[PDB]
Structure formats: C-alpha cells, structure tokens
C-alpha cells in the first residue's frame, strides 16, 4: 500500500522491495503464487547456512 | 497503405518555400559507373553533392536578394508521405534569374540526412 501510494502518478516517489525466503521449494512456489505484486522481488534459497 | 509521393515541400531555415511543380531532390552519395575493358569488371565510385531544384514565384515575400545571398542555409525536402531529407549547410548554385515572375533555385549541399 505504501509503495503503490508512492509509485502512484501524484507522489512521484519510486520504491522497490527486495526480499529473500529461506525454505523448501514448495513454500517459495506458494509464496510466489500468493503475492502477485509488481513492486516486490524475492529470491528463494533452500538450506542457507 | 501503399501511399505514394504527391506534393513535395521545400523548406529553408524552417520556413516553407513556394515550390510550384516537380521539385527535384538528388541525394548525396556515390555515382557508380561502368568499368569496361577486356570484359565488364564492376563499378567505379565518384563523390556527389546533394541537390534540390525548386521553382519559386518571383517578387514574393522571400525577395530576390535574400535568395542570392544564401551562402549557408539548412534546406529540407519533405515528401508528403512522411520521409524528409535535410541539407546540412547548403548554398545556392546556378545563376538565379527572375524571368516572368519565376525563379529557379538549385540549392546544393555536401550531404543529405534522412531525418524524421
């Protein structure tokens, strides 16, 4: 909500979110299906030390 | 669709010149010529200067003196279909003459650019 307000055509501020998920492949797939947002990007890792 | 060239507009310094009919544009490039000897071999190059031949009504607002003092101008030949060519640093060639309310302008430039 905050970024879409910023990324709106009036506020003119630009923001992008970067996240990393540690888990198994199924969880990352489910999260990617769930989110569906063009302002957030995630990287999936399995068993990150 | 397959639109074809209709009227051609001749502009100098971003201002239209009244060109009556059949304004001619010759692009700058190389004039390839035959090389014939024992047998035909290929073609020979020769540099060429871009040229715009237009015809302007005499006594117009442009004036004859302003025409004959065009050492450095920027000609533009625009085809109504959309393609236009610009002459960088063109000058008046030939011998201008105001015969019968009519003048012929041969504006020649080093090279022509396919702008727009």
């Amino acid at each position: 909500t905050e970024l879409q307000e910023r990324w709106g055509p009036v506020n003119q501020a630009d923001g992008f979110a970067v996240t990393v998920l540690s888990g198994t492949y199924g969880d990352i797939s489910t999260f990617g299906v769930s989110r569906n947002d063009h302002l957030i990007s995630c990287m999936g890792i399995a068993g990150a030390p | 669709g397959n639109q074809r060239q209709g009227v051609a507009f001749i502009r100098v310094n971003g201002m239209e010149l009244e060109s009556m009919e059949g304004a001619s544009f010759t692009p700058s490039g190389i004039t390839r010529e035959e090389v014939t000897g024992s047998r035909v071999y290929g073609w020979k190059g020769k540099p060429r200067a871009a040229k715009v031949e237009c015809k302007i009504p005499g006594g117009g607002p442009i004036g004859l003196d302003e025409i004959i003092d065009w050492e450095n101008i920027t000609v533009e030949f625009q085809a109504d279909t959309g393609e236009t060519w610009m002459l960088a640093n063109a000058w008046q060639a030939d011998e201008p003459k105001n015969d019968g309310g009519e003048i012929s302008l041969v504006l020649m430039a080093k090279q022509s650019k396919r702008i727009a």
């Binding site: - | 669709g1 060239q5 209709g6």
Partner: protein, 176 residues
C-alpha cells in the same frame, strides 16, 4: 481506396467550414441539367462528386478527379452574401489543395467553372464548381492465413492414361 478518400474530404470540409455551410453531401453523378430540381440543395452547401479517374503513373495508382459543387442563393438577381460565397469557394480551394486526404495525396487544383447557366439562374442558385485531381492508389491484394499440419504428399507421374499408374503416397511424419 476511393471511399475512404471521399470521407476524408467530407470530414475536412466539415471541420474547415463548420456551421457556415448548411450541409455537405456526396453527389451521385456529375451536375446535370436537372440536379437543381431534384436535390435537397438547402443553400449554402457544397456537394462532393466523384468524376472518375484517369490513368495514373503506375498500374497501382490512378488520377482521381473529384469535384466540389458550391451552392448559394441569388434572390432578386443578387447573391445572398457575395463575400461569403467567394470566401467559401476560396477556403475550399485553399484547404483542399496539396493536403492529403486518406490514401489519396497530392490534391492539385485543376479547374474552377462558374457553371451558372439559365437553368440555375432562374432557380435562384449559384453553382461555382471546383475540380481536383489526386494520386490515389489501388487496394492491395487480400492477404491469407492458414496453418494445416503437413502430413501427406501425393505424387503421380503423368504416364499415358491406360498405362499402369505410377505414384508415391509419401505420408511424411511417419516413423518406423
């Protein structure tokens, strides 16, 4: 591509003149000696009439000849507004000269006839008529689109009729 061109000229005339001209309407046929007693003139108004097409430069272009028939009223041997009708004719010539109209381009003025004999003078109308010629292209060949899987190739060697037949039914995409 003639109909698109005439629509373009009509739209241009409507935009240029607006409410000055009472109406604009394409005319079926050139102006004959009875068009005055048959049309809904409602002057002042202009009619666009296609007068045909002469041969063009190529085999894909022609020189279409259009005409603008301008109408007004001449009550008591006096034009309703002579400056108005002269301005209408002049602006029609100016705004429809050189400028492209759809596929057609290079609209060149060719002739302007007064075109007011007794038939129209006693009918209280002036009929100044403009003519135009334009380089209009012909429509292109209609494209096609189809995708069918190539599976069989039937070749038949043209042997004499009652000679035993020789042929190959190739049937591509067959695996063995």
């Amino acid at each position: 591509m003639l109909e698109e061109t005439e629509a373009a000229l009509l739209a241009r005339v409507r935009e240029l003149f607006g409410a000055t001209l009472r109406q604009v309407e394409p005319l079926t046929g050139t102006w004959t000696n009875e068009d005055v007693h048959r049309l809904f003139l409602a002057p002042p108004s202009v009619f666009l009439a296609w007068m045909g097409c002469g041969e063009g430069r190529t085999r894909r272009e022609v020189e279409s000849r259009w005409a603008f028939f301008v109408v007004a009223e001449l009550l008591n041997g006096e034009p309703v507004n002579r400056p108005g009708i002269y301005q209408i004719v002049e602006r029609l010539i100016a705004g429809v000269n050189g400028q492209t109209f759809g596929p057609t381009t290079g609209m060149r003025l060719t002739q302007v006839r007064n075109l007011c004999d007794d038939n129209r003078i006693n009918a209280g109308v002036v009929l100044y008529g403009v003519l135009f010629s334009g380089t209009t292209p012909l429509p292109s060949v209609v494209d096609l689109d189809s995708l069918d899987d190539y599976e069989r190739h039937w070749q038949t060697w043209k042997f004499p009729d009652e000679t035993p037949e020789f042929a190959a039914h190739i049937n591509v995409n067959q695996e063995k």
